[PDB]
Amino acid sequence: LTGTGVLTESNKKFLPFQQFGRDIADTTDAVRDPQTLEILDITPCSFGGV
Amino acid sequence: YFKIYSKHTPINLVRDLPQGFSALEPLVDLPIGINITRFQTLLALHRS
Ligand SMILES: *[C@@H]1O[C@H](CO)[C@@H](O)[C@H](O)[C@H]1NC(C)=O
Ligand SMILES: *[C@@H]1O[C@H](CO)[C@@H](O)[C@H](O)[C@H]1NC(C)=O
């Protein structure tokens, strides 16, 4: 799952079967780590208008 | 693929199904790749 963002600690408690979390835009908000098996919350980068 | 979803619920109703809401979690996915059109429950006898 390729992406670009800031990875933060996720308060969300995923169910054991669940590995991904999809926002209203069908883009992964959070992903369950494939090595340490924890939940990481993806947030987009600080885009802005100049 | 054979998907088995299951849920265990503690109830205290004597006869019929209780009325309520309980979403079934997915338990196990089986790579079987076979045709299935019929099923049968397996019970256990009690011998004395
Ligand atoms: C290997 O993966 C398992 C779970 O998939 C994890 O518990 C374990 O810590 C991992 N080992 C290393 C060295 O990352
Ligand atoms: C699956 O079994 C049914 C019952 O015999 C049969 O009608 C059907 O053609 C079978 N399908 C395949 C893909 O074998």
UniProtKB/Swiss-Prot annotation, chain B:
Changing N35Q: Increased resistance to neutralizing antibodies. Changing A23V: In strain: 20A.EU1. Changing D16G: In strain: Beta/B.1.351. It comes from the Viruses. Glycans are attached at N35. Changing I11V: In strain: Omicron/BA.2.75. Binds to host ACE2. RBD also interacts with the N-linked glycan on 'Asn-90' of ACE2. Cleavage of S generates a polybasic C-terminal sequence on S1 that binds to host Neuropilin-1 (NRP1) and Neuropilin-2 (NRP2) receptors. Interacts with host integrin alpha-5/beta-1 (ITGA5:ITGB1) and with ACE2 in complex with integrin alpha-5/beta-1 (ITGA5:ITGB1). May interact via cytoplasmic c-terminus with M protein. May interact (via N-terminus) with host bilirubin and biliverdin, thereby preventing antibody binding to the SARS-CoV-2 spike NTD via an allosteric mechanism. Attaches the virion to the cell membrane by interacting with host receptor, initiating the infection. The major receptor is host ACE2. When S2/S2' has been cleaved, binding to the receptor triggers direct fusion at the cell membrane. When S2/S2' has not been cleaved, binding to the receptor results in internalization of the virus by endocytosis using host TFRC and GRM2 and leading to fusion of the virion membrane with the host endosomal membrane. Alternatively, may use NRP1/NRP2 and integrin as entry receptors. This is Spike protein S1. The gene is S.
